[PDB]
């Protein structure tokens, strides 16, 4: 019952996976070839290892933030909320747009879980703290908060966000986007935030820009002295094929 957690344990072969991705990423991205992938894993491991899973700080990931510093085009950034798959498909098609997971640090840890025990210096493959049920300040959660902060700060000009029309309330303040990303959009650099609301399978013919959660988002962004555009993506499949040609 001591160090029993609710969320799933560390991903099988987590060390091998992170390195494999780091090698693969540097091959694809020539500007990040200066990064030593062993050093990245050291800074990654040292963050959460030999430390309690419920008491992680941003300074634990500070050394990893330095190793994985990256300068993507800040006018060509795409945020998302509960639309990871389609947002990635968009950036995979149109290559000049970047999501968080198209950066090194994001690429490494995407769809991965990890944590470590306090006493030992061994990774915990049995279980890891759930954000809601167990502990908010868990390795995964604290990582994503740190990287999403730096990524959101770096953005400028016209930032985009891809939302989900179907999933209940479209904008969610309690989400990582609503809490972290939105609040770190610096108005000095950022000018506009255009929202792309994606529909289901030709279910809603209505306009989802009048949704009160978008009006909230509008109000939030407006109070930061930032413009708020909003568009409807009625056909997602044709939209992906559109940007292709």
């Amino acid at each position, epitope marked *: 019952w001591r160090q029993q957690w609710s969320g799933p344990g560390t991903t099988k072969r987590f060390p091998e996976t992170v390195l*494999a991705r780091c*090698v693969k990423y540097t091959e694809i991205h020539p500007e990040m070839r200066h990064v030593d992938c062993q050093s990245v894993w050291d800074a990654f491991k040292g963050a959460f290892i030999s430390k309690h899973p419920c008491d992680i700080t941003e300074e634990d990931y500070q050394p990893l933030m330095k190793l994985g510093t990256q300068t993507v085009p800040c006018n060509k950034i795409l945020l998302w909320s509960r639309i990871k798959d389609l947002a990635h498909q968009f950036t995979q098609v149109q290559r000049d747009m970047f999501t968080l997971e198209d950066t090194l640090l994001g690429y490494l840890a995407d769809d991965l879980t990890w944590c470590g025990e306090f006493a030992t210096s061994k990774i915990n493959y049995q279980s890891c703290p759930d954000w809601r049920k167990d502990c908010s300040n868990n390795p995964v959660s604290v990582f994503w908060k740190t990287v999403s902060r730096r990524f959101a700060e770096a953005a400028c000009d016209v930032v985009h966000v891809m939302l989900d029309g179907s999933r209940s309330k479209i904008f969610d303040k309690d989400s990582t986007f609503g809490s972290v990303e939105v609040h770190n959009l610096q108005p000095e650099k950022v000018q506009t935030l255009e929202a792309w609301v994606i529909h289901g399978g030709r279910e809603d013919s209505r306009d989802l820009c009048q949704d009160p959660t978008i009006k909230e988002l509008e109000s939030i962004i407006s109070k930061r002295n930032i413009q708020f555009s909003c568009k409807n993506i009625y056909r997602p499949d044709k939209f992906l094929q559109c940007v292709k040609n």
Partner: antibody
Framework: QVQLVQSGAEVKKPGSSVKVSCKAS????????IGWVRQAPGQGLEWMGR????????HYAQKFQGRVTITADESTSTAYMELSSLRSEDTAVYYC????????????????WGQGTLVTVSS | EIVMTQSPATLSVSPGERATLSCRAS??????LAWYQQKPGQAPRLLIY???TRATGIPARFSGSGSGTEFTLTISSLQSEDFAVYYC?????????FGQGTKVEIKR
């Protein structure tokens, strides 16, 4: 010091699969990279993919991906490449080579190559 | 993928003359460009990497230069043993791509 020795040439039927070996020897470190290149008349030198035997990490070119799978036996220091759904255009000399770069996991350019294996796809 | 285009197709020079092989990348490849030498019935031999840097045990005769979309290989005091097909290879963009080749022929 390093030497790559590939398997011999052979004939294969259209649609069948081939598996070419590559026994490395005299490798300085445990972390190395084994690239794969084929040479066909008309197409020329085509990049296929890499492997990092320790990490068990593979990265393929989009053209071949799906058909190509590179495996490796880390103890014998032998890399393998399997190419399936063989067509007439896959008749070529398949090379392996040690990947070079600033790091030991890098495979950008290649200095030591294998002897090459002429796979012929014919009924 | 990036299309490496070498020129000329073939080149005919006497021993002692300076062979000048060209290489054009469809898009910029920084200085991530390697040169190779393939003699008959052999695997390629790495001459240059990083645009200009020679490999181990490669004569000073062979000289790489250029960056972006325009590279060059220069063979100073050409010899008869320098009969080969010379290839370039970008490694700035995955997947790696090679040129079609530049065959050097010897005049006697």
């Amino acid at each position: 010091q390093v030497q790559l020795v590939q398997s011999g040439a052979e004939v294969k039927k259209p649609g069948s699969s081939v598996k070419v070996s590559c026994k490395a020897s005299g490798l300085p470190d445990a972390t190395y990279a084994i690239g794969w290149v084929r040479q066909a008349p008309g197409q020329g030198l085509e990049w296929m993919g890499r492997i990092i035997p320790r990490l068990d990490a593979e990265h393929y070119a989009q053209k071949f991906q799906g058909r190509v799978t590179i495996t490796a036996d880390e103890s014998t220091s032998t890399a393998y490449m399997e190419l399936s759904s063989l067509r007439s255009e896959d008749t070529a000399v398949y090379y392996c080579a040690r990947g070079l770069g600033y790091y030991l996991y890098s495979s950008y350019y290649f200095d030591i190559w294998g002897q090459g294996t002429l796979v012929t796809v014919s009924s | 993928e990036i299309v490496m285009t070498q020129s000329p197709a073939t080149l005919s020079v006497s021993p002692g003359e300076r062979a000048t092989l060209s290489c054009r990348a469809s898009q910029s490849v920084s200085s991530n460009l390697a040169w190779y030498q393939q003699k008959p019935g052999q695997a390629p031999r790495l001459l240059i990497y990083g645009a200009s840097t020679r490999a181990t045990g490669i004569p000073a005769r062979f000289s790489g230069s250029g960056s972006g979309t325009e590279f060059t290989l220069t063979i100073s005091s050409l010899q008869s043993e320098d009969f080969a097909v010379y290839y370039c290879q970008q490694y700035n963009n995955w997947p790696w791509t090679f040129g079609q080749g530049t065959k050097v022929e010897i005049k006697r």
